[PDB]
Amino acid sequence: GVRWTLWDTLAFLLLLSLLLPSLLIMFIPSTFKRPVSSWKARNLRKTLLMASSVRLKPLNCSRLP
Amino acid sequence: GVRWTLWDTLAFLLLLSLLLPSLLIMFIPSTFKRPVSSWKARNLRKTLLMASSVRLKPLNCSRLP
Amino acid sequence: MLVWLAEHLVKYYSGFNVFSYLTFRAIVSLLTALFISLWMGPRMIAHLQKLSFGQVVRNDGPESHFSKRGTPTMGGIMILTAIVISVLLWAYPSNPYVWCVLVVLVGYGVIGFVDDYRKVVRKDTKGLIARWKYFWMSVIALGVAFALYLAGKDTPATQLVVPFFKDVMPQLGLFYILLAYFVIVGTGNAVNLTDGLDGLAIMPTVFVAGGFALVAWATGNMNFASYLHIPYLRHAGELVIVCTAIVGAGLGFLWFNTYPAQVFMGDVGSLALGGALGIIAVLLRQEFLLVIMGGVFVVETLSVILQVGSFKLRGQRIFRMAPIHHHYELKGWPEPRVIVRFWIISLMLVLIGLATLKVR
Amino acid sequence: MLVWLAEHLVKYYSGFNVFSYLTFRAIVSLLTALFISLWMGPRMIAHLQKLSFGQVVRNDGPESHFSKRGTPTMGGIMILTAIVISVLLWAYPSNPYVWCVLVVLVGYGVIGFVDDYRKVVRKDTKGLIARWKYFWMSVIALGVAFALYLAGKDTPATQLVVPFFKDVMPQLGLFYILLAYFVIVGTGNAVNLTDGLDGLAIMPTVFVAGGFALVAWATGNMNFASYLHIPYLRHAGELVIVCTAIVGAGLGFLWFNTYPAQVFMGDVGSLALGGALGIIAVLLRQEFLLVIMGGVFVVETLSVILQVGSFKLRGQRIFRMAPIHHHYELKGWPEPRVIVRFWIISLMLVLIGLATLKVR
Amino acid sequence: MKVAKDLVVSLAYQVRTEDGVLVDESPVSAPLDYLHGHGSLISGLETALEGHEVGDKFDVAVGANDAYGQYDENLVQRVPKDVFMGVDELQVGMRFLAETDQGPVPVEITAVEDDHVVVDGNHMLAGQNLKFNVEVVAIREATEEELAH
Amino acid sequence: MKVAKDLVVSLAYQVRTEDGVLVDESPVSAPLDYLHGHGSLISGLETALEGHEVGDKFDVAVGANDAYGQYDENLVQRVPKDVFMGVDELQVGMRFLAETDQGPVPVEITAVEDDHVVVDGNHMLAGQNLKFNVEVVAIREATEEELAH
């Protein structure tokens, strides 16, 4: 048959609506899936975060025995 | 009281022998607990790479397209 | 197949009778999947590099020791074939549910394979055309769901469970097909988003596979099925074997797939694992448990949908990027930290779902 | 407290009955540990940073974020407080076993704190003489072991279990004290030795805690005890709550201790977790199970002793250092990669340890 | 001869912003060359130039999205002063290149601080509509080096 | 009074290599103070000086194993010139200080390239055999500041 009680319909609709976002990704053009400009922003983030201000300073003298 | 069969003492010794390394840090000299020759070199290798992670360079370009 | 050969050799040596017990089969399947993945890894990565890039390469820092230049993006073959071999060796081949899971896994794996190959050799900007990819996904999912429904017509196999209510459990009839479509394809496409953070997709996948193994073990026994109040599917006894095989394959891939990944999983592995998880959640009446346990997948899909909805209606951005883990990445969290935080979240939700099924 | 308060309040409201069941208590223990950890952080991060660096330093945007500089080393206080709070709230005070675990954990955390505090507030490393730590560790361990021995003798409570075989099982006398001492102190040492990498030690601790939680659940029931042929220690039932709280605290800490860790575990957390694992493996007749499940710690310390003995006797070095993690760190594996390597190894070992109970 | 893929298009054009301010011009005496069908040219301009004969004079209106991506608040972002190289002191309007996994990405300075600087990667015309008055001076086949670049 | 743990040693030493070339010398008129029981110095000198009275003259042979350690090829690495400052043009033989998390370690330039340089972080005496002629001028207890340092 078909789900009868209001609880049945509510549960089925809730589960479908929770699986709905993963299946409406089908209709999203790839451009909106990952804009190229924002990808360049993430690449900038990776490079900048890789940057470290530690930078070799000169040494007065070496250690002694 | 005390154990009776060979397998009993065999099992107990196997258990103790496996835990003996875990308890031989008891008597491990401090000079050898943390090596020095390579440890210095190791942190120095990491720090060396961390200093040379990235560099930001100037540009001189023109309008598009 | 070896279990059949164990039934054959038991008559000559009683020792082989140990191969019949479920626990030994599960543990040995896990170990064999891990060992085959480990054996294949170093050869597969080098071979893929030759295909994808120059024949001779070697890691150098920081441009490739801590960065991901020159890393192949076709490593999902490891997961696919490890799962296939472990299941087909240590799982009963006469059970139709194992065959169903394997066929779904293989179909999604081949789709991912052709997509990755289009991207790596022909360098097409669109890669595999969306229409063909999705058409094949849909044909596979709909055929499998139709076969399962025909098998389970007017039979508890077509019922729907609810995490916190026991008495509500309708018979979906033809809507079983729609539900199978939604869970299989949705999780197949949701695991695709999760691949973009250097192992964010191998887990939850592993923890979810373990939870599904436990559920199938409980589901496959009359006493446990009655105590937990789950529909009883006799063939669930072998679904646990496939779940342990998936755990083994995922851990074997994570062997080499940690920051910095020696190989990206790609579609060949992501689609394979997502389809496997969705199909497992179909044969086991555990769609809600997949939803709860796989919170990262559903959250990333909801995040992309919500970001495009914002772009359409408001024009603002709810999250800096469509995948929410990438939004955290932009916030400042480094990849090694976001990946493990999402692993924490996935494990927490897996335990929460297991407890919820415990209580119902 | 809450368990007793709920028991008293049942008649006022019947909804309090839910708090009595074991599964719910364990689940809320895990959730409460995680909540306490995520609530102390990041507030505790800033408070402790002011102590160690004299000021709450910032990442200063995309500045160096993957260095040991700028990270406090007092992270274990969160673990200690979370475990204590969760146990006190969701465990029965009456059982002496929970009190033994709690006293061991608190004592070991204090011994680690007296070392770490002097490490910070003093420039040179010898602020605390290791002998103080070492002696008080031994004293608390011996006291607990002697108390457990006297609590029961000639009874299953003092019977070590052989992991694979079941017929071979001795009844221990005063040697039980030596076994408990060895297990607890070695586990504490190894967990302390494993904290060299921020995320290396906590996750294996979580895995062993979960394994011991499952074993205690099996240990605390006559039916399950006679099914698995493991001694039935009645007081061991509440140890499930302690193990689940440990798992939750470890997850909450690793939420912040992941590479690049915002704070290091330090002596406090490492010693406390090691002592908790040791006392759990002593109360449960599962010392060999601690060796198998916690194989990462044992192998690390074995490598340490092997390297030092090789230096002492011969000129060749078997490893590049005493620990394995550094040895692979120079083999070409970066820090987060090797952290996940050890995580996978620990997961496989804990699964094998859970499996070996069924071969009895 | 008409524009086709793999062919170099010498471009002489006069471009005005959305507000109507000239940015600059490309004289017919020295047209600028650009590949076709590779994405180097602006998407709207590249589509417009498809199939046009040599010497065709036309005006094409390209929106902000069509020309480039909309203004991104993620692209603009901070960075310490220490990271920079090749410049002793940062002034607003400077341009720098950050070499990245994905590829080269230009950036420009928009504000400065004593021990801090905020860096912007957005193009000057990223968030502005563009109108192009383009004339195709000549068309020729792309060289191997040009295709490689 | 003899040498003991946590005692400062005023050292006047004459050290020579196995080849027979001097590297440094501390005269008796200005002994160099050092801590004891810490191991920061050469292990051989530290161990030999143990239990020696004040003013005693002795000679001890020091090997590579007894020294800071053997030579390791990982300490010599090519690194760009941007990772130096404080020099108008990176010169050959200059010494630099890597501010490692463990502590200060030296980095010395072995060669210079156009945009890069070759440096080595290993100690000068690493992998060498040495002979120490030493004399304990005086002995005193280490101060709190000295112990902290």
Side-chain angles (χ1 to χ4, degrees):
Chain A
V2 159
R3 38 172 165 73
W4 287 101
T5 319
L6 166 139
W7 295 7
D8 310 350
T9 64
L10 176 58
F12 188 94
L13 287 165
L14 208 86
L15 195 137
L16 202 77
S17 297
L18 240 188
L19 274 301
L20 191 143
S22 62
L23 197 50
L24 301 214
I25 199 170
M26 303 207 295
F27 317 123
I28 273 155
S30 185
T31 56
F32 289 90
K33 195 177 180 182
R34 185 192 297 176
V36 64
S37 68
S38 74
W39 185 27
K40 294 183 20 207
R42 210 171 52 255
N43 316 139
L44 211 53
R45 284 331 301 291
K46 273 285 294 197
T47 63
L48 295 213
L49 179 63
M50 281 328 78
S52 161
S53 313
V54 305
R55 217 202 62 61
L56 253 166
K57 268 286 285 166
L59 176 67
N60 263 357
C61 173
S62 197
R63 199 168 195 136
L64 278 157
Chain B
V2 68
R3 332 188 201 99
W4 290 324
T5 166
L6 154 55
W7 273 61
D8 261 4
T9 181
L10 157 51
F12 195 96
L13 265 288
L14 283 165
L15 212 178
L16 262 183
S17 63
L18 286 157
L19 264 294
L20 189 104
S22 74
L23 215 35
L24 255 205
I25 310 308
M26 278 313 113
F27 304 76
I28 184 135
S30 195
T31 55
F32 314 135
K33 191 169 72 77
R34 269 278 164 182
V36 185
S37 196
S38 47
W39 152 261
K40 290 185 172 181
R42 288 152 145 286
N43 273 323
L44 178 55
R45 276 144 79 166
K46 285 172 144 180
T47 292
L48 204 33
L49 258 185
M50 183 86 17
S52 190
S53 299
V54 80
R55 45 169 152 170
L56 192 32
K57 197 169 179 184
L59 274 177
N60 297 292
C61 203
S62 89
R63 154 173 97 81
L64 298 177
Chain C
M1 286 251 269
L2 298 200
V3 73
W4 272 11
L5 267 184
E7 296 142 52
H8 216 45
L9 274 47
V10 76
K11 318 211 279 299
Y12 275 51
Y13 189 46
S14 77
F16 287 86
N17 203 340
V18 176
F19 285 40
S20 302
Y21 306 160
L22 178 50
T23 167
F24 164 100
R25 302 216 320 280
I27 281 282
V28 152
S29 95
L30 163 60
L31 283 170
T32 42
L34 191 53
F35 271 125
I36 184 135
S37 174
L38 266 42
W39 176 309
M40 208 154 57
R43 308 172 164 294
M44 180 139 300
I45 306 331
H47 186 90
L48 283 173
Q49 273 166 353
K50 286 188 197 162
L51 187 68
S52 302
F53 296 127
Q55 294 84 351
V56 187
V57 285
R58 177 66 176 192
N59 298 317
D60 57 355
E63 309 173 14
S64 74
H65 183 252
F66 197 78
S67 204
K68 285 174 304 208
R69 274 165 275 241
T71 80
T73 313
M74 248 204 76
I77 280 170
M78 287 186 49
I79 299 138
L80 175 59
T81 188
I83 297 168
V84 165
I85 181 56
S86 96
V87 171
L88 272 193
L89 270 161
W90 290 127
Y92 269 91
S94 154
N95 168 324
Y97 283 1
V98 202
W99 270 342
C100 198
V101 167
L102 267 201
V103 74
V104 164
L105 155 63
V106 164
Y108 280 33
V110 289
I111 296 161
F113 190 146
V114 309
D115 171 86
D116 278 325
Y117 205 86
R118 198 147 279 277
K119 255 185 60 65
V120 55
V121 83
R122 302 174 275 280
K123 297 278 151 165
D124 290 275
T125 306
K126 278 86 185 173
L128 186 58
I129 303 169
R131 194 179 46 70
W132 303 343
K133 150 147 139 202
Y134 274 19
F135 168 69
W136 288 128
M137 261 175 218
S138 34
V139 192
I140 272 297
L142 268 175
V144 167
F146 189 33
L148 286 176
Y149 163 88
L150 291 171
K153 196 206 178 187
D154 301 348
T155 281
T158 52
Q159 304 190 276
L160 169 56
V161 305
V162 196
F164 302 102
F165 301 142
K166 74 173 310 164
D167 217 10
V168 75
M169 85 183 320
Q171 258 218 346
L172 288 48
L174 283 163
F175 269 32
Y176 189 85
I177 273 153
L178 174 33
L179 214 30
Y181 195 65
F182 264 56
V183 81
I184 305 158
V185 181
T187 71
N189 249 304
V191 178
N192 285 151
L193 300 213
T194 303
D195 315 327
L197 278 187
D198 209 337
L200 187 68
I202 217 69
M203 307 174 148
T205 282
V206 168
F207 304 136
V208 166
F212 278 155
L214 252 196
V215 174
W217 172 78
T219 297
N221 298 301
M222 273 177 23
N223 284 314
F224 275 89
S226 324
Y227 176 92
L228 273 68
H229 305 306
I230 301 172
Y232 166 94
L233 311 98
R234 173 167 26 57
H235 292 134
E238 312 325 309
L239 250 171
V240 60
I241 308 315
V242 193
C243 293
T244 71
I246 288 154
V247 179
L251 286 170
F253 191 71
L254 190 42
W255 190 214
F256 309 100
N257 187 248
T258 302
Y259 213 62
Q262 304 183 234
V263 48
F264 285 108
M265 187 186 21
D267 284 51
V268 85
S270 185
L271 280 190
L273 279 169
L277 281 181
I279 200 49
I280 296 155
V282 174
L283 300 62
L284 304 169
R285 313 318 297 117
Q286 298 301 349
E287 284 64 354
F288 261 116
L289 279 199
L290 184 35
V291 168
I292 272 295
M293 292 174 169
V296 172
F297 299 161
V298 75
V299 163
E300 304 157 359
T301 60
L302 175 56
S303 100
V304 64
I305 284 292
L306 269 169
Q307 189 37 48
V308 278
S310 151
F311 216 79
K312 166 67 135 191
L313 308 175
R314 321 300 177 198
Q316 281 219 343
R317 314 207 221 230
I318 331 177
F319 320 150
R320 310 211 216 261
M321 222 165 276
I324 178 174
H325 51 261
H326 271 299
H327 157 58
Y328 281 150
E329 192 49 73
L330 262 66
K331 204 212 291 293
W333 297 3
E335 322 196 25
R337 221 151 65 160
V338 196
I339 185 183
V340 191
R341 280 172 147 113
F342 274 39
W343 289 6
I344 277 155
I345 270 172
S346 70
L347 183 49
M348 271 305 328
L349 275 60
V350 176
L351 306 162
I352 278 174
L354 287 174
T356 282
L357 160 78
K358 203 73 73 178
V359 85
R360 307 212 56 228
Chain D
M1 303 346 299
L2 268 279
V3 194
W4 273 1
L5 296 200
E7 188 163 26
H8 174 245
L9 277 173
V10 178
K11 100 176 165 38
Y12 297 80
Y13 311 83
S14 44
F16 286 117
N17 214 337
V18 181
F19 302 150
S20 157
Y21 291 13
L22 194 75
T23 181
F24 183 83
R25 285 154 41 200
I27 271 295
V28 316
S29 100
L30 154 80
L31 269 293
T32 288
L34 187 62
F35 202 60
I36 293 294
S37 295
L38 302 178
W39 178 24
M40 273 207 190
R43 176 179 301 75
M44 173 180 161
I45 281 314
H47 202 301
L48 258 161
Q49 205 168 41
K50 301 260 290 138
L51 173 140
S52 71
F53 292 67
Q55 42 176 11
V56 62
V57 307
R58 58 157 59 160
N59 198 233
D60 214 76
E63 199 152 76
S64 72
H65 208 173
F66 312 87
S67 149
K68 301 190 207 163
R69 199 172 179 268
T71 59
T73 166
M74 300 305 325
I77 275 160
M78 189 196 332
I79 297 201
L80 271 283
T81 284
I83 294 161
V84 188
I85 291 286
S86 306
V87 170
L88 282 193
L89 262 58
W90 318 124
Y92 278 78
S94 34
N95 291 7
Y97 276 27
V98 55
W99 271 140
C100 288
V101 191
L102 247 193
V103 72
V104 169
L105 179 99
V106 152
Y108 274 10
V110 165
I111 317 304
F113 186 61
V114 303
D115 211 305
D116 296 335
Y117 191 41
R118 298 181 167 235
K119 186 87 177 198
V120 185
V121 305
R122 175 192 213 79
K123 300 185 186 188
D124 52 310
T125 179
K126 318 170 177 196
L128 185 79
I129 299 304
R131 208 205 84 113
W132 177 270
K133 192 213 306 204
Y134 252 108
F135 156 97
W136 262 129
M137 255 210 83
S138 85
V139 179
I140 180 154
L142 263 155
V144 174
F146 187 72
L148 275 312
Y149 169 29
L150 289 173
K153 60 207 89 71
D154 209 55
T155 167
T158 45
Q159 289 188 14
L160 84 82
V161 169
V162 171
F164 288 37
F165 302 89
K166 148 265 272 182
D167 56 279
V168 52
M169 158 299 307
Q171 170 53 58
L172 277 56
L174 286 167
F175 282 19
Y176 175 112
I177 281 140
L178 193 152
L179 195 40
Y181 177 80
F182 259 51
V183 158
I184 306 159
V185 194
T187 305
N189 305 154
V191 173
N192 193 31
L193 209 61
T194 311
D195 79 56
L197 266 58
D198 50 14
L200 198 72
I202 192 64
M203 201 75 198
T205 301
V206 164
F207 276 140
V208 199
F212 287 163
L214 213 31
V215 173
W217 181 67
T219 306
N221 290 277
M222 298 215 66
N223 298 80
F224 285 87
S226 179
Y227 177 29
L228 308 187
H229 293 197
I230 311 276
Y232 164 50
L233 306 211
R234 174 271 311 300
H235 295 285
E238 287 296 288
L239 295 183
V240 178
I241 290 285
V242 183
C243 290
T244 309
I246 288 160
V247 164
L251 295 164
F253 188 67
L254 177 147
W255 179 279
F256 299 106
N257 191 41
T258 291
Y259 170 107
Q262 302 184 240
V263 62
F264 299 132
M265 198 156 28
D267 295 8
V268 171
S270 84
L271 259 300
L273 287 170
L277 288 185
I279 183 63
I280 290 158
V282 164
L283 271 43
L284 309 174
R285 308 311 307 134
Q286 298 292 2
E287 292 93 330
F288 269 103
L289 207 49
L290 179 51
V291 173
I292 298 176
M293 286 211 162
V296 167
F297 312 135
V298 178
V299 180
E300 285 178 43
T301 310
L302 172 43
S303 78
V304 165
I305 170 55
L306 280 168
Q307 185 79 340
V308 169
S310 265
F311 174 74
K312 186 64 163 64
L313 311 174
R314 325 191 300 110
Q316 291 169 332
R317 314 319 271 281
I318 294 290
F319 305 109
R320 323 302 199 90
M321 321 212 101
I324 295 296
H325 40 86
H326 293 303
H327 166 91
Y328 287 73
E329 200 147 84
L330 307 194
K331 182 61 68 167
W333 300 8
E335 176 163 1
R337 177 131 76 187
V338 61
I339 294 181
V340 174
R341 293 291 215 266
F342 280 31
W343 291 0
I344 307 329
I345 278 174
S346 208
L347 185 48
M348 211 55 38
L349 263 52
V350 66
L351 257 59
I352 297 285
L354 193 74
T356 190
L357 295 173
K358 275 293 301 313
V359 317
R360 300 182 87 263
Chain E
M1 67 201 161
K2 285 174 173 177
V3 174
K5 186 168 180 178
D6 308 330
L7 304 188
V8 164
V9 189
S10 68
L11 215 66
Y13 53 74
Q14 306 75 41
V15 180
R16 293 182 183 174
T17 63
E18 184 177 325
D19 167 46
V21 177
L22 178 76
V23 278
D24 200 59
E25 99 297 340
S26 186
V28 173
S29 58
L32 191 53
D33 287 17
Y34 256 91
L35 300 174
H36 187 71
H38 287 275
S40 304
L41 287 161
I42 285 170
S43 303
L45 174 58
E46 195 177 49
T47 56
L49 286 161
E50 285 177 317
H52 284 196
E53 48 78 26
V54 173
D56 205 356
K57 297 168 188 176
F58 67 103
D59 296 275
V60 63
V62 183
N65 302 52
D66 303 327
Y68 294 129
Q70 290 195 338
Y71 182 85
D72 279 29
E73 328 82 9
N74 317 309
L75 187 50
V76 55
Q77 203 135 7
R78 291 174 161 191
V79 85
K81 307 260 262 185
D82 300 279
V83 314
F84 282 94
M85 265 291 147
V87 161
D88 80 288
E89 51 76 20
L90 296 172
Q91 333 87 321
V92 165
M94 292 290 283
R95 295 182 286 180
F96 297 84
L97 180 36
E99 334 166 31
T100 313
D101 258 322
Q102 173 283 350
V105 86
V107 298
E108 153 146 49
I109 309 305
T110 183
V112 174
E113 192 265 330
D114 301 342
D115 298 316
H116 171 241
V117 47
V118 77
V119 166
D120 197 350
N122 264 267
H123 193 232
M124 307 305 96
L125 330 169
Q128 294 72 46
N129 168 334
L130 297 173
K131 46 176 296 309
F132 307 90
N133 184 0
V134 177
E135 179 176 345
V136 180
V137 176
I139 298 168
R140 63 175 178 76
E141 192 170 30
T143 73
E144 296 189 335
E145 298 190 339
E146 286 178 316
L147 292 167
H149 286 299
Chain F
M1 80 203 167
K2 285 171 172 176
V3 172
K5 183 180 176 182
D6 298 335
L7 296 189
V8 157
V9 176
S10 319
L11 210 76
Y13 62 86
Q14 160 45 40
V15 75
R16 198 166 245 147
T17 53
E18 65 83 36
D19 176 316
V21 49
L22 173 85
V23 292
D24 63 354
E25 203 291 313
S26 177
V28 173
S29 58
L32 183 44
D33 287 11
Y34 281 121
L35 294 175
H36 214 81
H38 291 261
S40 294
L41 310 182
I42 294 284
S43 308
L45 174 61
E46 189 84 343
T47 54
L49 152 63
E50 290 172 309
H52 283 188
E53 292 184 318
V54 172
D56 306 32
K57 302 175 183 177
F58 69 101
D59 298 341
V60 59
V62 172
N65 301 331
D66 156 29
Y68 290 125
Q70 319 319 320
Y71 192 98
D72 187 346
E73 295 189 333
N74 292 276
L75 281 83
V76 53
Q77 296 292 310
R78 206 211 47 54
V79 86
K81 286 173 123 173
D82 311 283
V83 305
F84 304 87
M85 86 221 98
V87 178
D88 291 89
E89 150 56 29
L90 301 210
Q91 323 174 350
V92 178
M94 321 325 278
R95 49 174 179 262
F96 262 82
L97 164 51
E99 296 274 68
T100 305
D101 52 39
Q102 160 262 17
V105 297
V107 202
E108 182 270 2
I109 301 181
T110 65
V112 170
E113 194 154 49
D114 189 12
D115 291 327
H116 303 258
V117 291
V118 192
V119 312
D120 190 356
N122 199 2
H123 205 278
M124 321 287 290
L125 61 95
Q128 302 211 52
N129 298 325
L130 312 167
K131 287 190 181 182
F132 290 69
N133 160 37
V134 190
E135 178 173 358
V136 172
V137 177
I139 290 285
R140 66 174 176 77
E141 188 169 36
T143 74
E144 297 191 335
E145 297 188 339
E146 287 173 326
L147 292 166
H149 289 294

